[PDB]
Every structure is written in structure tokens, then in C-alpha cells.
Design a protein around this ligand. Sequence first.
Ligand SMILES: *[C@@H]1O[C@H](CO)[C@@H](O[C@@H]2O[C@H](CO)[C@@H](O[C@@H]3O[C@H](CO)[C@@H](O)[C@H](O)[C@@H]3O)[C@H](O)[C@H]2NC(C)=O)[C@H](O)[C@H]1NC(C)=O
Ligand code: NAG
Ligand code: NAG
Ligand code: NAG
Ligand code: NAG
Ligand code: NAG
Ligand code: NAG
Ligand code: NAG
Ligand code: NAG
Length: 691
Amino acid sequence: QGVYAPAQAQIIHAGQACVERVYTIREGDTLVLQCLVTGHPRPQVRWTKTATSVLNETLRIEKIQRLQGGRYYCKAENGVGVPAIKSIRVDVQYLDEPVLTVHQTISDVRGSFYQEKTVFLRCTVNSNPPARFIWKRGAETLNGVDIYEPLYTQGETKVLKLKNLRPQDYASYTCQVSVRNVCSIPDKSITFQLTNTTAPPALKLSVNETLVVNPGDNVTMQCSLTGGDPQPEVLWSHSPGPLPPNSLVQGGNLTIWRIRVEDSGYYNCTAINNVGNPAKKTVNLLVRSMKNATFQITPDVIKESETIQLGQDLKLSCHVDAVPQEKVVYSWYKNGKPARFSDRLLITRNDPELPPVTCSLEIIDLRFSDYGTYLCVATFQGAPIPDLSVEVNISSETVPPTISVPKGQSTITVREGSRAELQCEVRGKPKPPIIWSRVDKETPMPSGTMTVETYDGKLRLESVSRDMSGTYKCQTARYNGFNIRPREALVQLNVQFPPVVEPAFQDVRQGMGRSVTLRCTMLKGSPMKVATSVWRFNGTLLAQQDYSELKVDSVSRETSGSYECSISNDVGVSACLFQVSAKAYSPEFYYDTPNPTLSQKQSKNYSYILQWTQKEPDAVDPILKYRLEVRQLAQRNTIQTFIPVQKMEKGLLLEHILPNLKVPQSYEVRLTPITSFGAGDMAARIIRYME
Ligand SMILES: *[C@@H]1O[C@H](CO)[C@@H](O[C@@H]2O[C@H](CO)[C@@H](O[C@@H]3O[C@H](CO)[C@@H](O)[C@H](O)[C@@H]3O)[C@H](O)[C@H]2NC(C)=O)[C@H](O)[C@H]1NC(C)=O
Ligand SMILES: *[C@@H]1O[C@H](CO)[C@@H](O)[C@H](O)[C@H]1NC(C)=O
Ligand SMILES: *[C@@H]1O[C@H](CO)[C@@H](O)[C@H](O)[C@H]1NC(C)=O
Ligand SMILES: *[C@@H]1O[C@H](CO)[C@@H](O)[C@H](O)[C@H]1NC(C)=O
Ligand SMILES: *[C@@H]1O[C@H](CO)[C@@H](O)[C@H](O)[C@H]1NC(C)=O
Ligand SMILES: *[C@@H]1O[C@H](CO)[C@@H](O)[C@H](O)[C@H]1NC(C)=O
Ligand SMILES: *[C@@H]1O[C@H](CO)[C@@H](O)[C@H](O)[C@H]1NC(C)=O
Ligand SMILES: *[C@@H]1O[C@H](CO)[C@@H](O)[C@H](O)[C@H]1NC(C)=O
Ligand SMILES: *[C@@H]1O[C@H](CO)[C@@H](O)[C@H](O)[C@H]1NC(C)=O
């Protein structure tokens, strides 16, 4: 490629800037960067910040922000050689209003019981560039007292330390912070009234550390100041989440109406006045609830049993999830209630190694007299909430569980996106719930956690993703049944999905007598086999290995057009699209030359050196002639002429002088190649008098 030259970029600065390698502007202004490029063919330009991208030789950002600052890249490519890249660092600049805060420090003195008070005046401001701080008490401070930047701060903060605090120091101190007026940014000031009444905030709360309540109850909390100068600002907050709904803040008073169980949590009242540590009082609000009452049958452990056998230990545990967990109390009944007071032979244990906070009675030397219906009742002492119970019949019939997959739903295949339903079925007395997990990987579930409880033994997946395709485990719970090694069973999940073929579009060129073959290849797809391929031409079907091929015997006017191969797996369809013709490629205008020729500076005429190259001359039938059209933008009528080609090769520069052009005006130039097939791809350009 003799005349083809690789791209070359150069960034240029415009829009608003201020004051080498960097483009500094005030936040809120507008950025305007332009990428000038050269090389042939004329390269295209995208602005990016990664090296996302905007396809434009000029980058323009209105009302720029702090974060939009950074390094920007102009990328320019044309096919020939290595793409051109150029960088520029945009440094958006700003100066917010400074914050002024103060705290005291009392400290001992060597060999003395006298004490020295020290105040720290801390001035913080976020700014680009690094700010400049000046301190004043009406007058500028230099010396006796000290200025510095404290630790754990990168110059955004300066502190004025007043070591021994004598009355004359009690004045108004004012931090004035400047950005050097760079980018014409004003300085800003903040002042503080340091007085012997100045004091950090303090609060008193009308309720205890932790407050227990029932659902529905209205609860109101008064948070009142007990100290603070300046007058601090009191604020309530909640974790997790925000306060509302159903809760109103008078200010200081926080009331919660019709409290729901999910409203439980920490409510924090905090006072701030930029003096000392902000005061906070914290109350933990606990709404009562009881959920998920569960029992466990644990056969003799020491005899390593998994089954109810006479002459063995049988533990029957009991548990429920409650907010004031420590406050629950359990009652064990049996065909009516003995309240588990027997002890001898049958005994109560409330806290063994078993799960947390579980009442569990043991039966030593199990007897037929122990076969019965046992009930455990969890309750809160004199609480309005309802009690919860768990019945568990023990008899000869009670037996550990077994789990299986029904029929051959072991592997269940579905198409991506649809819903999937995995099923396990469990047998035993009692029948425990099933816990579904994934085994091929460690991912979560419908419930968003590693495992999911289910009693119907069904696991439903609404929007199934191919990523989810894998193996899944279903197993017996250790609760609401035997507490034994869970029984397990696996099911496979195939997530089929439609094909993806290549190329989506391809522009194919070839001479008039010659042949061409189009291939549509399948890259991804489950099933990964071409079930069928169907080729169409300009809308109509044609008659006809991982891919499909079609051969156009003779690329002619009758055969040239758009070909579509619709490849499909048993699940979906996807298509390649080919454009076949014997049209020559577009001419590529050459932009980098001094062009105009003044004809005797008279007749109001100049001439233009129109130059270009022919893209891929040997891709189709040889180029015979170019059709040249010239319009001057001002007259509708156009002068059409034909250039006859002498000879050409890839990259050869072509020329044609346009003879009669009004001396000031510009023109549109349309250049079309002609082969035996006819008109190739037309190209266009605007020419102008330069000098
Ligand atoms: C209802 O209550 C029962 C227990 O009373 C809950 O079963 C418990 O579920 C948790 C997981 O949520 C299990 O803890 C986990 O154990 C694995 C190891 O097995 C560990 O890797 C995890 O970090 C986590 O600690 C716990 O073992 C299990 N307890 C029993 C006795 O099986 C059940 O989840 C509750 N259901 C609901 C809907 O609240
Ligand atoms: C570049 O962006 C401007 C708007 O900022 C737009 O007017 C112009 O047409 C764009 N350039 C191109 C080549 O589209
Ligand atoms: C503080 O200063 C004021 C006058 O500025 C004075 O009335 C007061 O006694 C001083 N001492 C205290 C503890 O406020
Ligand atoms: C809380 O107040 C509302 C009316 O403001 C009332 O309907 C509700 O019953 C109150 N809460 C209780 C526990 O009574
Ligand atoms: C908060 O409520 C109490 C009475 O419940 C009242 O004395 C106090 O003024 C209230 N505070 C506000 C800011 O309304
Ligand atoms: C409220 O205080 C608790 C206890 O100190 C704390 O865990 C929680 O993060 C705090 N929440 C807020 C919003 O301050
Ligand atoms: C226990 O057995 C009784 C009668 O034998 C029955 O009414 C009750 O429903 C059974 N309980 C369970 C949990 O099966
Ligand atoms: C197919 O359609 C394209 C676009 O309309 C057209 O250029 C071509 O001549 C058509 N081919 C035939 C054989 O009609
Ligand atoms: C100047 O241009 C006009 C219009 O294009 C043409 O008629 C005329 O012959 C030209 N004169 C010369 C001296 O080239």
C-alpha cells in the first residue's frame, strides 16, 4: 500500500479552561476537546476514557463534574498500521465551603496538680487543587501557638492549636480557605465563636438501652438536650433502613405507630454542634415475635442409632425463633401434660449441645408406655402474642426418612428464561422438609441464601439462567423429624439456549463470472448441533456439520443480493446475513495535499486537485471508468463527467483536476467506479477554495 499512511492524532483544546499536558476547567463549565487526525484512508475517531466511547472527533461535556475529571484518550484508526492514541488529563477544579469544628483537651503538668486546657480548631474543605488555609482572629495568625495538618488527612485539613488557653484567646476565630483564585474560583470563609460557654452536646433519653414491645403498640421516644453551645441539632436514625413508614419525628420526639415486627432494630438519637464528639443516645427496639416452631427426634446417640428402639435413649427437642429469644419458655405435654416433672427415667434438659435455646426431654430405657403424642408449647410470660406448639407422635410406626427423585426426573432439561421445577419426594414418619442446595458450585438460591426449605419437595426457579445449569442436591431436614445424617439425592438441570452464529452480517464482493461460497458457523448452543439450516435469497427460500455452506455458482445481477442462513438448534433460531454482489468498493478520497489552483487569478475560476485511492481494486471486475459529479451547493444542476482509468494497484494515488470553479465558492464531489457489472459504491466529498 504505497500511499496508505497509518493514522496520527493530536488533541486540541477549546471550550472553557483556565490560566502543558492538562486541561483544567472549573466544575460546572463545559469541556470541549477536539482530536485532529491525519493519514490515509481518513481515520475515524472515538473519544474514550479507558483505552465508554463517543464516536466524534470532538469531545464535549456540559456542566462537568468532579468525577468526570481524569485522563481521556482519543483513538484514531484506519486499517493501515497501528491505531493512533493520544492522552490528556482533564483536571476539573472546585472549592466547597469549609467546615469548622473544635474540641477541648485537658492535660496534666510535670510535677504539678495544675491542668492546662487546649482547644483544637479544625478546618476542613474538599477542593481541587489542594487548598490554602489562613487563620485569623480578626488578625492573621503566624509562633506562640501552632498550625499544622493532623494525621489521617492528606492536606484537606488544618488545625489551629491553642496550647495554654488564657481568656484573651476566647475570641472569634475564622478559617479562610483559598484555591489561589485559579480557574477564577473565589475564596471562602467560616468563623466560630470560641467562648467559655462553648461546650459539646449532651442528650438524655426517656427510655432504656433496650426496649421490648408487642406488635401494633405505639411507642414514643423523647430525646432531649442536656448540654451544648452552639445549640446542637438533634436527629433520629434507624438501622436497618430508614425510619418511616408509620413513624413521625416531631423533632426530639420519635413516635412509631402500629409498629410492625420488621420495624425492630436500633433507633439512634444524635446531637451535633461541631464541638467535641457528637452526642448519641441509642435505643434497641425489639418487637416480639415467634416463628418456625420445630421439633427433633434424636435416637440413641451413644448406641449410634438412627431409629426408635425400645431400651434406648430418645431425645425430643423443641425450638422456636423469637426476637427476645432469651425470654421464651417451653412446656412439654404428653397425651395431656405432665409438664415434664417426672425426671426418673424421663427427664428434662433445657440446654444441651443441640441447637441454640432448645428445650429437650430425654427418655432413658424407652418403653411401650412412652409411645404417645408429645406436645411442646413455646410461650412468652404473660405476653399478648399467641403461643406456638409442635406435636410429635411417637409410635412403632415412627421411622427415619428416605429421599428419592420421582420416576426419572433426575435430569430435567428446560429452555433458558422459562421456569424450572425440581422435585424430590421424601418418605418416613414424620416426613421432614427438604433442603435444596447446589453442589457443582457454591451459589445461592431462590431465597437468596445457600439453602432453601421446602415441604412439598418442589423447588421452583422462575428465570432460569444457563449459569444455573448444573447439579442440585435435595436432602432431609434435621428438624421436624429425625436428627440424623440427612439423606441425599441429586438432580441435573440442563438449561438449553438458542444458537449464536457467525457472521451476523458480511459484505461479500466478487467478479461477475466467478463463484462464491457463504458459510454460517455455529459457535455457542445447547444442543451444540446444527439441527437444520435454511437459506433464503431476497426473501425467498432456496433448495439444498457444525455449520452450513451455500455456493453461488455465478455472481451475477440475478444472483447478487442478500442471503440469509437461518441455522437452528432444537430450541431456537439464529441467522447469518450475507450481501453478495460484484460492485466495486468505494473510492477513498485523499485529504492531505495542497489543493487549489488559481486560474490566472481571473475569470473568477480556480481548479482543484481531486485525489483519491481505489479500495480493493482486484476484489471485483477491473475498474474501467469513474463517474464524476460536481455540484456547487448553490445551483441544483450538476456537471457529470467520466474519468477513464489508466491502470491501478492497491494504494496507488489517483488524480483529476476540476477545471472551472467559481473563485470563492465550494462544491460537492461524487465519485463512482464503473465495472462491467455497473456502478460500484459511490463516495462523496466537499471541495473548497483555500488560496
Ligand atoms: C427453622 O429453624 C431451624 C432450626 O431450629 C433452622 O434450621 C437451621 O438452619 C440453619 C441455616 O439457616 C443451619 O445453620 C447452618 O449450618 C451450616 C452447616 O450445617 C453452616 O455452614 C451455616 O453457616 C449455618 O450455620 C442449622 O444447622 C439448622 N438447624 C437445624 C437443627 O437443622 C431453619 O433454617 C429455620 N427455618 C426458617 C425458615 O427460619
Ligand atoms: C459531534 O457532536 C456534536 C454535538 O456536540 C454534533 O453536532 C456533531 O454532529 C457530532 N459529529 C458527528 C460527526 O456526528
Ligand atoms: C465566662 O465569661 C463571661 C464573660 O465573658 C463571665 O460572665 C463568666 O463568669 C465566665 N466564666 C464562665 C464559667 O462562664
Ligand atoms: C396507636 O394509635 C392509633 C391511633 O393513633 C390506634 O388506632 C392504635 O390502637 C394505637 N395502638 C394501640 C396498641 O392501641
Ligand atoms: C415531645 O412530647 C412531650 C410530651 O409527650 C412534650 O412535652 C414535648 O414538648 C414534645 N417535644 C416536641 C419537640 O414536640
Ligand atoms: C445505631 O447504633 C447502633 C449501636 O451502636 C449501631 O450498630 C448502628 O450502626 C447505629 N446506626 C446509625 C444509623 O447510626
Ligand atoms: C397423633 O395421633 C392422634 C391420634 O392417634 C391424631 O389425632 C394426631 O393428629 C396425631 N398427630 C400427628 C402430628 O400426626
Ligand atoms: C435483491 O435485492 C437487492 C436490494 O433490493 C437488489 O439490489 C438486488 O438486485 C435484488 N436481486 C434480485 C435478483 O432481484
Ligand atoms: C470560468 O468558468 C466559467 C463557468 O464555469 C466558464 O464558462 C468559463 O469558460 C471559465 N473561464 C476560463 C477562462 O476558464
